[PDB]
Design a protein around this ligand. Structure first.
Ligand SMILES: CC1(C)OC(=O)c2ccccc2[C@H]1n1cncc1C(F)F
Ligand SMILES: CC1(C)OC(=O)c2ccccc2[C@H]1n1cncc1C(F)F
Ligand SMILES: CC1(C)OC(=O)c2ccccc2[C@H]1n1cncc1C(F)F
Lengths: 159, 158, 158, 158, 159, 159
């Protein structure tokens, strides 16, 4: 029935992302975890890496489908027959950008409804960017990542 | 059958609220528009008045059920077999309070998932309180309220 | 001849308000400092008291006219032939409310253009309410108020 | 010997407050937990009740002294020979008010330095007011309050 | 009499900018629409392009003058005998930066008064950046731009 | 007794930084002013320059020690036996990032307590970035910098 899309760069997927997509799967029949292919900011992991890490970290969720996309998110959501756009809501500065993005997406595809989900307090203060920056400077980010992601990030930063 | 609850004081229900509940009905099979008694807010309209205004203003939506309540939110949602709690997200200062509410409601009922919807730009700068204050100075608030609500607010202040 | 109106509760007028209206008079030919009755805020000073305090505190500014009003803002501005509505912008939480006000006032009078001015850093962290609360505990608020206002606040709390 | 004061209404003291004062005692030699009378907030508990609840809830901390006061903050801090004023920082809307408070307190006592501490994520979304409102609807607030405070809030609402 | 300056990068000018400058022209006798020449972020359109697009899109407003500048804004405003600085106010995150900018401009030129105008709800959630990003990824931004700007942006992205 | 660290990039140190570190020295027995060595954003002044400018501008404060560091801040604070982390709090957008940073630092080193100090109203609206940008475009930033820093910045921008 209800098809939802949860897009992002997921570079890499964090426990914050797992919390959001898990909540989405309890609400909607099918959830597409949609990984943006060619972000303008050179992602740390390749698209194939981000997709494979996210598949592994969500494999326990029956109704998640991990797919990469390079179109405008709204164009891809339209072609996937999604009517729900999942966005994670952490802090107020996130909120301001999300409101601009949501109004633009509504202009581009009014039949796509943006829904904002709220993560656990546990993940309410992290981001892929902060995690990467901490790990790059020899900080412990084990608590923030799925184990498979933690292993790949160590491997990535070792070289 | 996905059951969602949209709680609030709705004193009175505005077009902003109609926007949110309409989006909700497009997403979920059954939506309970749930009117909190909220005596501490000293509402302008009684709970029975607010319930009847919202019933009339949502009557065109097949899958809306308007109910009044004075229970703890989490208990009322459990008792209505809802697993989704809808809140409208206007501006940053609302957002902060909503996070406290949602984290409190999650603590009390972890299977009740809060979802925030965003209203049209048309209603992004109004509130029940602002409309009431405009009407208190006899300003034209027809654009912001359902007809039946507009009349009742007029009659109330006359 | 450009006419601007600077409305507010001004209970009491502070140096922050003096800063804003002074900037306004440097920009526009005639500035109406317009004191809202605001009975719902239960002001400390009566409208007549607030009007006289502001008259005295702005008397050095040639092109300020102090007036009290209880009308709808948009009507009073239309009736004063103003096309500019001045508001002071302090912090983010004020900003959110001001946008709702300005969008409401624009809806009711689209030719009334809201302009926001920014006060000196010196007054960017005070408000009428904060000063009153300090004075209620006999703290020194001479730095934040015009002399005549300081005296009246003293006399009031004595 | 560094003396710090942690003022607030503490109506009632929550685990969020316990978190802050505990962090304070790890940083400063002596911490005065100072309970403002705040009659304008119409507190649920009397000053004497709030003082006794906080005394009991902080009794395990050797270097906490609980005191009630109705003075101007700056005077009470001067009179207690404190040079540090502790405030907890939750969210953006608190932050704005705290800056106004700290700049006012600095004006009145420039040697009183405000320091903001950040509570655990566990308490980052609660407040005395939110807990009271939950308890008013008989929701379970045991997780948010010290045992003695939880009992007193129960007894009060019974 | 009263000379006002409305500076920005206008890369490209949007309907949000037209709304602001139009409101400014109803308030002040002469409005200089001032286009910053060499922003550090390589603008999509050249200065000559931005100026010509803005001239065309404001030609109906009698008391607008479109000019490019490369000095510090305050230095240019001083040399132009402007005493009013028009800033558009969209959302709270804009506001924080605008307050820092306005206090700096006041330090640099105290006789230049910053005034913040508020755009229509219609344009309260867009920016040149978001519009460009949407258009670059094959989204429809026709509603946000003057027709002449829409034509030039399509031409720009076709190559 | 109590050792506090005040880290940053200090590129260059401003009067806002002097205000904060001065308040810190009145509160804590020893204050390490810790200058991050290799920020990802190519700092205007070298690490040796930033350290020498900061030493000169704080030389009047007896209990300040200026040191450079290249580790993760928390790792350096741990190795320096600091238990207080001084952060300066200017505006709400600062606050949101500071909360994420403080929670991360608490995860990485729970015995390091973050404390937020508030600067004078005089410096509540400036940053190293805005000062640099103004100076680079021929604006007067004399009021915002220690004299030694003002001299070095002019020298830097002359070439
Ligand atoms: C209906 C209330 C009274 O129920 C509560 O339990 C409660 C508890 C604490 C604060 C506020 C509330 C209210 N609330 C909860 N969630 C949505 C709402 C309402 F404002 F729409
Ligand atoms: C003067 C009031 C009562 O007039 C109104 O119409 C109104 C309508 C709704 C909210 C608030 C208001 C007030 N207001 C409007 N604009 C500025 C102000 C004032 F707060 F300065
Ligand atoms: C205790 C009060 C009454 O003391 C004042 O002087 C005052 C003055 C103005 C506003 C608010 C206050 C209160 N306050 C100051 N600093 C912390 C607090 C308190 F809220 F914890």
């Amino acid at each position: 029935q209800k098809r939802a899309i949860y897009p992002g760069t997921f570079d890499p997927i964090t426990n914050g992302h797992i919390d959001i997509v898990t909540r989405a799967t309890q609400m909607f029949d099918h959830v597409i975890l949609a990984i943006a292919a060619s972000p303008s900011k050179k992602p740390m992991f390749t698209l194939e890496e981000r997709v494979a890490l996210a598949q592994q970290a969500t494999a326990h969720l029956g109704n998640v489908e991990v797919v990469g996309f390079s179109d405008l998110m709204a164009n891809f959501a339209r072609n996937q027959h999604a009517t729900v756009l999942i966005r994670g809501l952490r802090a107020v500065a996130d909120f301001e950008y999300e409101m601009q993005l949501a109004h633009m997406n509504r202009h581009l595809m009014p039949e796509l409804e943006s829904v904002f989900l709220m993560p656990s307090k546990e993940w309410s203060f992290i981001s892929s960017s902060l995690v990467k920056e901490v790990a790059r400077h020899q900080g412990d980010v084990t608590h923030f990542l799925p184990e498979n992601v933690h292993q790949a990030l160590m491997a990535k930063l070792a070289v």
